[PDB]
Every structure is written in structure tokens, then in C-alpha cells.
Design an enzyme around this catalytic site. Structure first.
Site, PDB file in Angstrom:
ATOM      1  N   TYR A 125       0.828  -1.200   0.000  1.00  0.00           N
ATOM      2  CA  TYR A 125       0.000   0.000   0.000  1.00  0.00           C
ATOM      3  C   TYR A 125       0.864   1.251   0.000  1.00  0.00           C
ATOM      4  CZ  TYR A 125       1.029   0.767   4.982  1.00  0.00           C
ATOM      5  OH  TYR A 125       1.670   0.979   6.190  1.00  0.00           O
ATOM      6  N   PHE A 158       1.441   9.774   3.419  1.00  0.00           N
ATOM      7  CA  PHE A 158       1.729   9.678   4.843  1.00  0.00           C
ATOM      8  C   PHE A 158       2.405   8.373   5.256  1.00  0.00           C
ATOM      9  CE2 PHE A 158      -2.776   8.273   4.519  1.00  0.00           C
ATOM     10  CZ  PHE A 158      -2.682   7.013   5.077  1.00  0.00           C
ATOM     11  N   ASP A 159       2.350   7.327   4.433  1.00  0.00           N
ATOM     12  CA  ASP A 159       3.069   6.085   4.718  1.00  0.00           C
ATOM     13  C   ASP A 159       3.043   5.221   3.468  1.00  0.00           C
ATOM     14  OD1 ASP A 159       4.615   4.341   6.310  1.00  0.00           O
ATOM     15  OD2 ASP A 159       2.841   3.203   6.930  1.00  0.00           O
ATOM     16  N   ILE A 175      -8.109  -0.782  10.040  1.00  0.00           N
ATOM     17  CA  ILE A 175      -9.190   0.184   9.936  1.00  0.00           C
ATOM     18  C   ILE A 175     -10.336  -0.414   9.126  1.00  0.00           C
ATOM     19  CG2 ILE A 175      -7.821   2.267  10.312  1.00  0.00           C
ATOM     20  CD1 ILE A 175      -7.934   2.527   7.105  1.00  0.00           C
ATOM     21  N   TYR A 206      -9.613   6.888  10.749  1.00  0.00           N
ATOM     22  CA  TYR A 206      -9.203   7.297  12.088  1.00  0.00           C
ATOM     23  C   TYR A 206     -10.156   8.284  12.751  1.00  0.00           C
ATOM     24  CZ  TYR A 206      -5.165   4.601  10.926  1.00  0.00           C
ATOM     25  OH  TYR A 206      -4.338   3.553  10.587  1.00  0.00           O
ATOM     26  N   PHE A 239      -5.749   4.837   0.222  1.00  0.00           N
ATOM     27  CA  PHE A 239      -4.776   3.751   0.237  1.00  0.00           C
ATOM     28  C   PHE A 239      -4.750   3.142  -1.157  1.00  0.00           C
ATOM     29  CE2 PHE A 239      -5.820   4.110   4.700  1.00  0.00           C
ATOM     30  CZ  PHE A 239      -4.601   3.946   5.326  1.00  0.00           C
TER      31      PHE A 239
HETATM   32  C1  R27 Z   1      -2.034   1.820  17.292  1.00  0.00           C
HETATM   33  C2  R27 Z   1      -1.402   0.662  17.099  1.00  0.00           C
HETATM   34  C3  R27 Z   1       0.126   0.713  16.891  1.00  0.00           C
HETATM   35  C4  R27 Z   1       0.777  -0.657  16.526  1.00  0.00           C
HETATM   36  C5  R27 Z   1       1.943  -0.313  15.556  1.00  0.00           C
HETATM   37  C6  R27 Z   1       2.749  -1.212  14.922  1.00  0.00           C
HETATM   38  C7  R27 Z   1       2.632  -2.756  15.065  1.00  0.00           C
HETATM   39  C8  R27 Z   1       3.850  -0.619  14.005  1.00  0.00           C
HETATM   40  C9  R27 Z   1       3.393  -0.643  12.518  1.00  0.00           C
HETATM   41  C10 R27 Z   1       4.589  -0.967  11.593  1.00  0.00           C
HETATM   42  C11 R27 Z   1       2.753   0.768  12.208  1.00  0.00           C
HETATM   43  C12 R27 Z   1       1.696   0.824  11.050  1.00  0.00           C
HETATM   44  O1  R27 Z   1       2.259   0.295   9.845  1.00  0.00           O
HETATM   45  C13 R27 Z   1       1.666  -0.918   9.375  1.00  0.00           C
HETATM   46  C14 R27 Z   1       1.302   2.322  10.673  1.00  0.00           C
HETATM   47  O2  R27 Z   1       0.286   2.180   9.629  1.00  0.00           O
HETATM   48  C15 R27 Z   1      -0.086   3.503   9.133  1.00  0.00           C
HETATM   49  O3  R27 Z   1       1.062   4.215   8.740  1.00  0.00           O
HETATM   50  C16 R27 Z   1      -0.977   3.247   7.927  1.00  0.00           C
HETATM   51  O4  R27 Z   1      -0.586   3.380   6.804  1.00  0.00           O
HETATM   52  C17 R27 Z   1      -2.450   2.736   8.162  1.00  0.00           C
HETATM   53  O5  R27 Z   1      -3.343   3.479   8.342  1.00  0.00           O
HETATM   54  N1  R27 Z   1      -2.699   1.262   8.150  1.00  0.00           N
HETATM   55  C18 R27 Z   1      -1.603   0.219   7.914  1.00  0.00           C
HETATM   56  C19 R27 Z   1      -2.019  -0.879   6.933  1.00  0.00           C
HETATM   57  C20 R27 Z   1      -3.376  -1.398   7.133  1.00  0.00           C
HETATM   58  C21 R27 Z   1      -4.454  -0.435   7.374  1.00  0.00           C
HETATM   59  C22 R27 Z   1      -4.128   0.710   8.327  1.00  0.00           C
HETATM   60  C23 R27 Z   1      -4.311   0.238   9.801  1.00  0.00           C
HETATM   61  O6  R27 Z   1      -5.325  -0.218  10.190  1.00  0.00           O
HETATM   62  O7  R27 Z   1      -3.151   0.403  10.668  1.00  0.00           O
HETATM   63  C24 R27 Z   1      -3.276  -0.272  11.899  1.00  0.00           C
HETATM   64  C25 R27 Z   1      -3.764   0.871  12.975  1.00  0.00           C
HETATM   65  C26 R27 Z   1      -2.883   2.116  13.190  1.00  0.00           C
HETATM   66  C27 R27 Z   1      -5.023   0.642  13.684  1.00  0.00           C
HETATM   67  C28 R27 Z   1      -5.580   1.661  14.712  1.00  0.00           C
HETATM   68  C29 R27 Z   1      -5.304   1.162  16.112  1.00  0.00           C
HETATM   69  C30 R27 Z   1      -5.949   2.080  17.122  1.00  0.00           C
HETATM   70  C31 R27 Z   1      -7.435   2.231  16.896  1.00  0.00           C
HETATM   71  O8  R27 Z   1      -7.930   3.178  17.801  1.00  0.00           O
HETATM   72  C32 R27 Z   1      -7.738   2.676  15.463  1.00  0.00           C
HETATM   73  O9  R27 Z   1      -9.151   2.634  15.255  1.00  0.00           O
HETATM   74  C33 R27 Z   1      -9.597   3.334  14.072  1.00  0.00           C
HETATM   75  C34 R27 Z   1      -7.079   1.797  14.446  1.00  0.00           C
HETATM   76  C35 R27 Z   1      -1.904  -0.894  12.408  1.00  0.00           C
HETATM   77  C36 R27 Z   1      -1.539  -2.114  11.533  1.00  0.00           C
HETATM   78  C37 R27 Z   1      -1.991  -1.288  13.951  1.00  0.00           C
HETATM   79  O10 R27 Z   1      -2.918  -2.321  14.063  1.00  0.00           O
HETATM   80  C38 R27 Z   1      -0.555  -1.825  14.354  1.00  0.00           C
HETATM   81  C39 R27 Z   1      -0.262  -1.713  15.937  1.00  0.00           C
HETATM   82  N2  R27 Z   1      -0.812  -2.497  16.746  1.00  0.00           N
HETATM   83  N3  R27 Z   1      -1.750  -3.480  16.331  1.00  0.00           N
HETATM   84  C40 R27 Z   1      -2.113  -4.418  17.379  1.00  0.00           C
HETATM   85  C41 R27 Z   1      -1.457  -4.235  18.755  1.00  0.00           C
HETATM   86  O11 R27 Z   1      -2.889  -5.280  17.163  1.00  0.00           O
HETATM   87  C42 R27 Z   1      -0.789   4.262  10.249  1.00  0.00           C
HETATM   88  C43 R27 Z   1      -1.259   5.653   9.731  1.00  0.00           C
HETATM   89  C44 R27 Z   1       0.141   4.426  11.398  1.00  0.00           C
HETATM   90  C45 R27 Z   1       0.760   3.145  11.843  1.00  0.00           C
HETATM   91  O12 R27 Z   1       1.819   3.470  12.715  1.00  0.00           O
HETATM   92  C46 R27 Z   1       1.394   3.584  14.061  1.00  0.00           C
END
Ligand code: R27
Length: 107
Positions: A26, A36-37, A56, A82, A99
Site C-alpha cells: 500500500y 503519509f506512509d 481500519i 481514524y 490507500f
Molecule cells: C495503534 C497501534 C500501533 C501498533 C503499531 C505497529 C505494530 C507498528 C506498525 C509498523 C505501524 C503501522 O504500519 C503498518 C502504521 O500504519 C499507518 O502508517 C498506515 O498506513 C495505516 O493506516 N494502516 C496500515 C495498513 C493497514 C491499514 C491501516 C491500519 O489499520 O493500521 C493499523 C492501525 C494504526 C489501527 C488503529 C489502532 C488504534 C485504533 O484506535 C484505530 O481505530 C480506528 C485503528 C496498524 C496495523 C496497527 O494495528 C498496528 C499496531 N498495533 N496493532 C495491534 C497491537 O494489534 C498508520 C497511519 C500508522 C501506523 O503506525 C502507528
């Protein structure tokens, strides 16, 4: 929400279902195309379980409309991304997100 803009077609046969794992490249951008990513920038596609609230909602509802190999834009209104809170340091409140995704593999 999610609007699917078609770019390159998939095989038209293999669509993800709820509970499947998917492998997807993506590029995420704002409405004007500002990135943004990107998993492409990391040299490695993103993997998750789809349809179960792990990503999401625009992914949960949009990725299941793609077939393996397809490239498309998943345009998500903020209630499918978000929402009111945004993502700190990255995504503002109420943001429409793009995306550009490519579905590589289903398990
Ligand atoms: C907050 C969790 C941090 C924790 C971080 C990591 C493992 C590090 C990882 C390499 C970062 C992500 O890189 C894949 C980044 O992805 C993006 O850059 C992107 O492009 C982006 O939007 N996405 C990436 C590709 C698919 C679609 C989308 C997505 O859904 O992302 C997940 C996310 C931030 C969910 C929120 C979660 C909170 C809740 O309130 C919201 O409700 C609305 C939803 C993301 C996969 C999350 O699940 C992963 C995590 N823990 N998961 C668990 C523990 O199960 C977003 C903008 C920012 C993310 O950096 C924080």
C-alpha cells in the site's frame, strides 16, 4: 464509506473473506496525494487478518472487494479510518484517506 477506484484488475476469482490473512502493498496518502506512509518504501508488503477489526474498517470492508493481483485505490471517509481523533503526528481529525493497495496473496 469506502470507495474502490479500479486501477489494475486482479484474477477475478480469489477474493478475501472475513478471517483470511492477506498480503498487500500500500501507499497511503491524503486527498491531494501527499503520502503519509508506504509499505513499498519499506521493501516489504503488509500482512494482516482481514475482516476482524485488526485494521481500519475501510480495509476490512474494501480489501474483500479485491481479487488477487488487483491494484486499486481504497478511498476511506474518516468514519472508516481514524475518525474524530485522527492519528497523532500523522493524520488530522476527520481525514479522508487514500490507500493505493495491491493484493498480493490470500491465506
Ligand atoms: C495503534 C497501534 C500501533 C501498533 C503499531 C505497529 C505494530 C507498528 C506498525 C509498523 C505501524 C503501522 O504500519 C503498518 C502504521 O500504519 C499507518 O502508517 C498506515 O498506513 C495505516 O493506516 N494502516 C496500515 C495498513 C493497514 C491499514 C491501516 C491500519 O489499520 O493500521 C493499523 C492501525 C494504526 C489501527 C488503529 C489502532 C488504534 C485504533 O484506535 C484505530 O481505530 C480506528 C485503528 C496498524 C496495523 C496497527 O494495528 C498496528 C499496531 N498495533 N496493532 C495491534 C497491537 O494489534 C498508520 C497511519 C500508522 C501506523 O503506525 C502507528
Amino acid at each position: 464509506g469506502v470507495t474502490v477506484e479500479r486501477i489494475a484488475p486482479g484474477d477475478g476469482k480469489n477474493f478475501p473473506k472475513k478471517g483470511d490473512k492477506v498480503t498487500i502493498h500500500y501507499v497511503g496518502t491524503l486527498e491531494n496525494g501527499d503520502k503519509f506512509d508506504s509499505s513499498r518504501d519499506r521493501g516489504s508488503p503488509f500482512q494482516c487478518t482481514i475482516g476482524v477489526g485488526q485494521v481500519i474498517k475501510g480495509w476490512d470492508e474494501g480489501v474483500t472487494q479485491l481479487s488477487v493481483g488487483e491494484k486499486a485505490r481504497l478511498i476511506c471517509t474518516h468514519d472508516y479510518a481514524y475518525g474524530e481523533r485522527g492519528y497523532p503526528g500523522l493524520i488530522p481529525p476527520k481525514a479522508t484517506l487514500n490507500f493505493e493497495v495491491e493484493l498480493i496473496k490470500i491465506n
